[PDB]
């Protein structure tokens, strides 16, 4: 079992800049037994370099791998935003195949502020009983952000899910969701549903809120 | 241009057997040049090679260690396939479960994990499947930013994961997002997919979300109409 470790974990470059990926392997390997592979999301990982130093067929020359016995290098000479991916190293010992648990590459990018949008619920939830409001942060950058709900100026807990999306391919940003349930009983009993939202693109906190 | 079709999204009882089919495109499974794998995916086993099965004057098969007495891979000449059987399954093997072909690509010897199935999310739980329900999130004034405003549906209550989302039959795909599940505290999924569209639209053209939870085999249009 030779175990393959990366390094970094995380790593977050701007476009343009060179990507220095490593793969450290727990004993020697042959060079012949290491590859790479990229994994975008939603798809099954893609074969990248093998062999160490060869590009499989149709990676573009600014990818190339390096490396032998312990240490193996993937170097990404110059980013383009598409290349936002986990990457994989992984060797064959003939019977068994292992992966490192991966790096992650964050596309760097200027700050944007979100776009805040709510939406009450649906008259159609609301007549079975459930009423869920969602707050929408879209298309911001850094990835945090905070959001909090105020229902009739009361600072709400523990009653609201955030999802965040993955960086978008179109612009490397991020989008978000808080979404607060109640019950209609619970909705019906209040006026003024507010979300405020602070991120550090924006001059001031931003609150969308809306009367029933 | 060997192309792999794995089956469906599934959900299976903790201590039951996984079973899963990959239909093979493009080439034969009982090529002497390939060697037919499995892989599975999630946050507790990293990216994890599971076993191989392969034809060389005979049927060979090669397992992992992790898993050497639980599984079996089977291929299926008749049909130009091979599956996956794990017995006894644990909530540890949830995962993306990818097939992919293995070819010789150093002189002979390495071989190398070259083409890959889409995936399929097995989930290990012993709740029962139930489709979601749909709701429209409506445009309104509160939903709008400068002359750009967003809708989106809400997709609730269902089991297990995944649901896709298209929008307009997949004729609108500029500034869609749709959101990572969430789980409820009732034990059932819910996600919302929003897109930001102009709001000099809204009167004229038509939104409709598409919901697909194959699991329940549930298809749902929702037309988004602005409330106001």
């Known amino acids: 079992e030779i175990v393959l470790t990366q390094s970094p974990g995380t790593l977050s470059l701007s476009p343009g800049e060179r990507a220095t990926l490593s793969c450290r392997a727990s004993?020697?390997?042959?060079?012949?037994?290491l590859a790479w592979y990229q994994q975008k999301p939603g798809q099954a990982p893609r074969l990248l370099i093998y062999?160490?130093?060869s590009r499989a067929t149709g990676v573009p020359d600014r990818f190339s791998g390096s490396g032998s016995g312990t240490d193996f290098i993937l170097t990404i000479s110059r980013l383009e935003p598409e290349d936002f991916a986990v990457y994989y190293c992984?060797?064959?010992?003939?019977?068994?195949?292992?992966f490192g648990q991966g790096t992650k590459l964050e596309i760097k990018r200027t700050v944007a502020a979100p776009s805040v949008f709510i939406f009450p619920p649906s008259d159609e939830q609301l007549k079975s009983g459930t009423a869920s409001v969602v707050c929408l942060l879209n298309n911001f950058y850094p990835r945090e952000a905070k959001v909090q709900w105020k229902v009739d100026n009361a600072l709400q807990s523990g009653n609201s899910q955030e999802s965040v999306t993955e960086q978008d391919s179109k612009d490397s940003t991020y989008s978000l969701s808080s979404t607060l349930t109640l019950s209609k009983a619970d909705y019906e009993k209040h006026k003024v549903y507010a979300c405020e939202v602070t991120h550090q693109g924006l001059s001031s906190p931003v609150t969308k809120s809306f009367n029933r | 241009q060997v192309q792999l079709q794995q089956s469906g999204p599934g959900l299976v009882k903790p201590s039951q057997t996984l079973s899963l089919t990959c239909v093979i495109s493009?080439?034969?499974?009982?090529?002497?040049?390939?060697?037919w794998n499995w892989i599975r995916q999630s946050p507790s086993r990293g990216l994890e090679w599971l076993g191989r099965?392969?034809?060389?004057?005979?049927?060979?098969?090669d397992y992992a260690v992790s898993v050497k007495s639980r599984i079996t891979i089977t291929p299926d000449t008749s049909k130009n396939q091979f599956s996956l059987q794990m017995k006894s399954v644990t909530p540890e093997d949830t995962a993306v479960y990818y097939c992919?072909?293995?070819?010789?690509?150093?002189?002979?010897?390495?071989?190398?994990?070259?083409?890959w199935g889409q995936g399929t999310l097995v989930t290990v739980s012993s709740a029962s499947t139930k489709g979601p329900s749909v709701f429209p999130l409506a445009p309104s004034s509160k939903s709008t930013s400068g002359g750009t405003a967003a809708l989106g549906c809400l997709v609730k209550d269902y089991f297990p994961e995944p649901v896709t989302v298209s929008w307009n039959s997949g004729a609108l795909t500029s500034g869609v997002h749709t959101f990572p599940a969430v789980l409820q505290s009732s034990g059932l999924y819910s996600l919302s997919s929003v897109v930001t569209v102009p709001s000099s639209s809204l009167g004229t053209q038509t939104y409709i979300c598409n919901v697909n939870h194959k699991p329940s085999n549930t298809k749902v249009d929702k037309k988004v109409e602005p409330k106001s």
């Open positions: 004993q020697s390997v042959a060079s012949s037994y």
């Open positions: 992919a072909r293995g070819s010789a690509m150093i002189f002979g010897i390495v071989i190398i994990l070259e083409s």
């Open positions: 099965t392969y034809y060389r004057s005979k049927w060979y098969t």
């Open positions: 493009g080439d034969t499974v009982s090529s002497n040049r390939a060697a």
């Open positions: 062999g160490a130093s």
């Open positions: 992984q060797q064959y010992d003939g019977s068994q195949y292992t």
